[PDB]
Design an enzyme around this catalytic site. Structure first.
Site, PDB file in Angstrom:
ATOM      1  N   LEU A  15       0.819  -1.210   0.000  1.00 10.69           N
ATOM      2  CA  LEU A  15       0.000   0.000   0.000  1.00 10.69           C
ATOM      3  C   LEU A  15       0.858   1.268   0.000  1.00 10.69           C
ATOM      4  CD1 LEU A  15      -2.659  -1.201   2.581  1.00 10.69           C
ATOM      5  CD2 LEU A  15      -3.093  -0.763   0.137  1.00 10.69           C
ATOM      6  N   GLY A  16       2.042   1.216   0.605  1.00 13.00           N
ATOM      7  CA  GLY A  16       2.935   2.364   0.667  1.00 13.00           C
ATOM      8  C   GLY A  16       3.862   2.354   1.861  1.00 13.00           C
ATOM      9  N   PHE A  20       7.935   4.499  10.555  1.00 14.37           N
ATOM     10  CA  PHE A  20       8.566   3.325  11.180  1.00 14.37           C
ATOM     11  C   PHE A  20       8.486   2.025  10.329  1.00 14.37           C
ATOM     12  CE2 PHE A  20       6.641   5.983  14.555  1.00 14.37           C
ATOM     13  CZ  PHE A  20       7.798   6.588  14.984  1.00 14.37           C
ATOM     14  N   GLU A  22       6.880  -0.228   6.356  1.00 16.20           N
ATOM     15  CA  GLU A  22       6.037  -0.373   5.160  1.00 16.20           C
ATOM     16  C   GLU A  22       4.669  -0.886   5.551  1.00 16.20           C
ATOM     17  OE1 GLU A  22       7.085  -1.019   1.145  1.00 16.20           O
ATOM     18  OE2 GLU A  22       7.933   0.924   1.739  1.00 16.20           O
ATOM     19  N   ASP A 132       3.607  13.476  16.004  1.00 20.35           N
ATOM     20  CA  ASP A 132       3.991  13.620  14.610  1.00 20.35           C
ATOM     21  C   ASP A 132       2.773  13.779  13.716  1.00 20.35           C
ATOM     22  OD1 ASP A 132       6.716  13.139  15.391  1.00 20.35           O
ATOM     23  OD2 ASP A 132       6.297  10.984  15.383  1.00 20.35           O
ATOM     24  N   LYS A 134       0.617  15.239  11.006  1.00 23.21           N
ATOM     25  CA  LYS A 134       0.894  15.961   9.768  1.00 23.21           C
ATOM     26  C   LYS A 134      -0.153  15.519   8.715  1.00 23.21           C
ATOM     27  CE  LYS A 134       4.344  12.400   9.075  1.00 23.21           C
ATOM     28  NZ  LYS A 134       5.729  12.013   8.688  1.00 23.21           N
ATOM     29  N   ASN A 137      -0.715  11.765   7.710  1.00 24.92           N
ATOM     30  CA  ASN A 137      -1.366  10.926   8.710  1.00 24.92           C
ATOM     31  C   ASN A 137      -2.884  11.115   8.719  1.00 24.92           C
ATOM     32  OD1 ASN A 137       0.940   9.607   9.791  1.00 24.92           O
ATOM     33  ND2 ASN A 137       1.435  11.373  11.010  1.00 24.92           N
ATOM     34  N   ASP A 153      -1.344   6.345  13.042  1.00 21.26           N
ATOM     35  CA  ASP A 153      -0.097   6.294  13.822  1.00 21.26           C
ATOM     36  C   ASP A 153      -0.187   6.977  15.206  1.00 21.26           C
ATOM     37  OD1 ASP A 153       0.928   5.022  11.582  1.00 21.26           O
ATOM     38  OD2 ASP A 153       2.050   6.789  10.862  1.00 21.26           O
ATOM     39  N   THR A 172       8.271  16.861   7.864  1.00 21.03           N
ATOM     40  CA  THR A 172       7.888  16.805   9.279  1.00 21.03           C
ATOM     41  C   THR A 172       8.187  18.107  10.047  1.00 21.03           C
ATOM     42  OG1 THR A 172      10.022  15.906   9.936  1.00 21.03           O
ATOM     43  CG2 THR A 172       8.290  14.304   9.293  1.00 21.03           C
TER      44      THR A 172
HETATM   45  C1  LIG Z   1       0.962   4.875   4.362  1.00 16.38           C
HETATM   46  C2  LIG Z   1      -0.372   4.352   3.836  1.00 16.38           C
HETATM   47  C3  LIG Z   1      -1.146   5.494   3.187  1.00 16.38           C
HETATM   48  C4  LIG Z   1      -0.102   3.280   2.788  1.00 16.38           C
HETATM   49  N1  LIG Z   1      -1.193   3.783   4.966  1.00 16.38           N
HETATM   50  N2  LIG Z   1      -0.715   3.923   6.257  1.00 16.38           N
HETATM   51  C5  LIG Z   1      -1.636   3.430   7.042  1.00 16.38           C
HETATM   52  N3  LIG Z   1      -1.484   3.271   8.379  1.00 16.38           N
HETATM   53  C6  LIG Z   1      -1.332   2.102   9.158  1.00 16.38           C
HETATM   54  C7  LIG Z   1      -1.486   0.825   8.632  1.00 16.38           C
HETATM   55  C8  LIG Z   1      -1.338  -0.282   9.451  1.00 16.38           C
HETATM   56  C9  LIG Z   1      -1.032  -0.129  10.792  1.00 16.38           C
HETATM   57  C10 LIG Z   1      -0.834   1.142  11.285  1.00 16.38           C
HETATM   58 CL1  LIG Z   1      -0.285   1.338  12.924  1.00 16.38          CL
HETATM   59  C11 LIG Z   1      -0.995   2.264  10.498  1.00 16.38           C
HETATM   60  C12 LIG Z   1      -2.777   2.948   6.290  1.00 16.38           C
HETATM   61  C13 LIG Z   1      -4.067   2.384   6.479  1.00 16.38           C
HETATM   62  N4  LIG Z   1      -4.585   2.140   7.686  1.00 16.38           N
HETATM   63  N5  LIG Z   1      -4.824   2.112   5.395  1.00 16.38           N
HETATM   64  C14 LIG Z   1      -4.324   2.380   4.183  1.00 16.38           C
HETATM   65  N6  LIG Z   1      -3.149   2.928   3.861  1.00 16.38           N
HETATM   66  C15 LIG Z   1      -2.410   3.198   4.948  1.00 16.38           C
END
Ligand SMILES: CC(C)(C)n1nc(Nc2cccc(Cl)c2)c2c(N)ncnc21
Ligand SMILES: [Ca+2]
Length: 451
Positions: A15-16, A20, A22, A132, A134, A137, A153, A172
Site C-alpha cells: 500500500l505504501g 517506522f 512499510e 507527529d 501531519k 497521517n 499512527d 515533518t
Molecule cells: C501509508 C499508507 C497510506 C499506505 N497507509 N498507512 C496506514 N497506516 C497504518 C497501517 C497499518 C497499521 C498502522 Cl499502525 C498504520 C494505512 C491504512 N490504515 N490504510 C491504508 N493505507 C495506509
C-alpha cells in the site's frame, strides 16, 4: 509470543511507506477480511520503552474506538519484526483529495479540522499523544463525498525512535511543535500541529517555512509567523483567532483540543467565498513535497538495488558446476538466503511469497542466473522509478517538460541536498543551462548516489 503473523494473514499488495515501516494490504486466511498491516523492522527502528510498556499501550489502543481514529485489530512480534494490524482505508491522503477538487472554502476547512479535533480530543482523554501529526497521517475512509478523516499512527512515537534519515524526515519540520524539539512536551503538541495544518488549509503555505530543514526548525523554535500574505484578506477573523490560540508558544497557555471544538469558528462554519489562491498553493506544495520524497526514495532504491544485486550474485556464484546455470529450487533457496542475510522484505511475508516472486521472474526469464538477477532486481525498484517520473510530471503543472533552477533549489532544499553539491552535479550531466528535463533530473539523482 506464541502466535505467528503469516499463519493468520497473507500479503496481497504493498500500500505504501508510513512512519517506522512499510504498510501491506493483507487478508485473513480464514474469514477473508482485508486489513492494512504496518511491518516495523527491529533492526532499522529502536524502541524508546520496554516490551511491557508497548504491550500495555497496544492492548489499550485495541479497545479504543472513535470514527476519526484508525482502528487497530491485532499486534504480532517475531525475532526481527513488529506487525501492527488494523483497518485499511482507500480514500487516500486528505491533501491529495483537496488538490483534485476545484472549490475549497472555510466550511470545508472547518469540517476537516472539527473531525481532526474530535479524534485528538478523544485520544487525549485516554492519555495518548501523537507528536507527529501531519497531513500524510490524515487518510480518508473511502473514495466518497462524505468520506470521514481517519488519523493514523497515534501512540507510535511514544514507543518508537524517530528516523534520522531524510527520506523518512521529509515534510515533518513544518508541523512539529517547538516544545517537542526541546524535549519537554505533552498532549498540547498535537494542537500546535493541527494549528499548522489549519494555517496551510486556509492559505496553502506553511506558517514556518524555509529553504532547508534547519531553516524551518529555526522558524518553529522562534515561533513567530504572520498573516501578511494576500490570500488571508479573503479569510475570516475568527479563523485567524483560532490559529493564534492553537499556535500559542507556551503549551500551558495554548488552547486544548476540547476547547478548540467549542471555538466560534468551528461552531459557526459547521452549522462564504472559495479560497482559489489556497488550492493553487496546496497543489504546488503537495507536488513539491511528493517530488522531493520520490527523489530521495529513488536514490535509496538505487543504493539498496546495487547492494542486493552484488549480494545475490555472490550467493548464486557459491551455489553454482561452473557454466553459470541454476535450477528453480536453487534460485528460490538463494533468494530466501538473501532475506535471511539482509532481513525479511515487507512485500514477501513467508516462503510461499518468495516462491511466487521467483515464478514471476522466471515467466520473463537450467537458466542463466546473471539474467535472473537483472530482472528480479529491476522489479524491486519498479515502484521507485515509475513514482519518480509520475511525481516529476505532476510537479510540472504547465507540462513544459522541464523544471527551472529555482524549482531545483526548492526541490533539493526540501530533500536536504547541499546547493553546491547539486549545482556541481548538473554541470557533468549537462555542460551547456537554467533548466532540466526528466532524463537530466534522473541523471542528476543517479550522480548524487554514486552512479
Ligand atoms: C501509508 C499508507 C497510506 C499506505 N497507509 N498507512 C496506514 N497506516 C497504518 C497501517 C497499518 C497499521 C498502522 Cl499502525 C498504520 C494505512 C491504512 N490504515 N490504510 C491504508 N493505507 C495506509
Ligand atoms: Ca515545467
Amino acid at each position: 509470543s506464541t502466535a505467528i503473523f503469516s499463519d493468520r494473514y497473507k500479503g496481497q499488495r504493498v500500500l505504501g511507506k508510513g512512519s517506522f515501516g512499510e504498510v501491506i494490504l493483507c487478508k485473513d486466511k480464514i474469514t477473508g477480511q482485508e486489513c492494512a498491516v504496518k511491518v516495523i523492522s527491529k533492526r532499522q527502528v529502536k524502541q524508546k520503552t520496554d516490551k511491557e510498556s508497548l504491550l500495555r499501550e497496544v492492548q489499550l489502543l485495541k479497545q479504543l474506538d472513535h470514527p476519526n481514529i484508525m482502528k487497530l485489530y491485532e499486534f504480532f512480534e517475531d525475532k526481527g519484526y513488529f506487525y501492527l494490524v488494523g483497518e485499511v482505508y482507500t480514500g487516500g491522503e486528505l491533501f491529495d483529495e483537496i488538490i483534485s477538487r476545484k472549490r475549497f472554502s472555510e466550511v470545508d476547512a472547518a469540517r476537516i479540522i472539527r473531525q481532526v479535533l474530535s479524534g485528538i480530543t478523544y485520544m487525549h482523554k485516554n492519555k495518548i499523544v501523537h507528536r507527529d501529526l501531519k497531513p500524510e497521517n490524515l487518510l480518508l475512509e473511502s473514495k466518497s463525498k462524505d468520506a470521514n478523516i481517519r488519523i493514523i499512527d497515534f501512540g507510535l512515537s511514544t514507543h518508537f525512535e524517530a528516523s534520522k534519515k531524510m527520506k523518512d524526515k521529509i515534510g515533518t519540520a513544518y508541523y512539529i511543535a517547538p516544545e517537542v524539539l526541546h524535549g519537554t512536551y505533552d498532549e498540547k503538541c498535537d494542537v500546535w500541529s493541527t494549528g499548522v495544518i489549519l494555517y496551510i488549509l486556509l492559505s496553502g503555505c506553511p506558517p514556518f517555512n524555509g529553504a532547508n530543514e534547519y531553516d524551518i526548525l529555526k522558524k518553529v523554535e522562534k515561533g513567530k509567523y504572520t498573516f501578511e500574505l494576500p490570500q488571508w484578506k479573503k479569510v475570516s477573523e475568527s479563523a485567524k483567532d483560532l490559529i493564534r490560540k492553537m499556535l500559542t508558544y507556551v503549551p500551558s497557555m495554548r488552547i486544548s483540543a476540547r476547547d478548540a471544538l467549542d471555538h466560534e469558528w468551528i461552531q459557526t462554519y459547521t452549522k462564504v467565498p472559495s479560497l482559489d489562491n489556497a488550492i493553487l498553493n496546496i497543489r504546488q506544495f503537495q507536488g513539491t513535497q511528493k517530488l522531493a520524497q520520490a527523489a530521495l526514495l529513488y536514490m535509496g532504491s538505487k543504493l539498496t538495488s546495487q547492494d542486493e544485486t552484488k549480494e545475490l550474485t555472490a550467493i548464486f556464484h557459491k551455489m553454482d558446476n561452473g557454466d553459470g546455470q541454476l535450477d528453480r529450487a536453487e534460485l528460490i533457496e538463494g533468494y530466501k538466503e538473501l532475506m535471511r542475510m539482509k532481513g525479511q522484505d515487507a512485500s514477501m511475508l513467508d516462503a510461499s511469497a518468495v516462491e511466487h516472486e521467483v515464478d514471476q521472474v522466471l515467466d520473463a526469464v537450467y537458466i542463466e542466473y546473471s539474467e535472473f538477477v537483472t530482472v528480479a532486481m529491476d522489479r524491486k525498484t519498479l515502484l521507485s522509478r515509475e513514482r519518480l517520473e509520475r511525481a516529476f510530471r505532476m510537479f510540472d503543472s504547465d507540462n513544459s517538460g522541464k523544471i527551472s533552477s529555482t524549482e531545483l533549489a526548492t526541490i533539493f532544499g526540501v530533500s536536504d541536498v547541499d546547493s553546491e553539491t547539486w549545482k556541481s552535479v548538473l554541470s557533468e550531466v549537462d555542460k551547456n543551462d537554467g533548466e532540466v528535463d526528466f532524463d537530466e533530473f534522473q541523471q542528476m539523482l543517479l550522480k548524487l548516489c554514486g552512479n
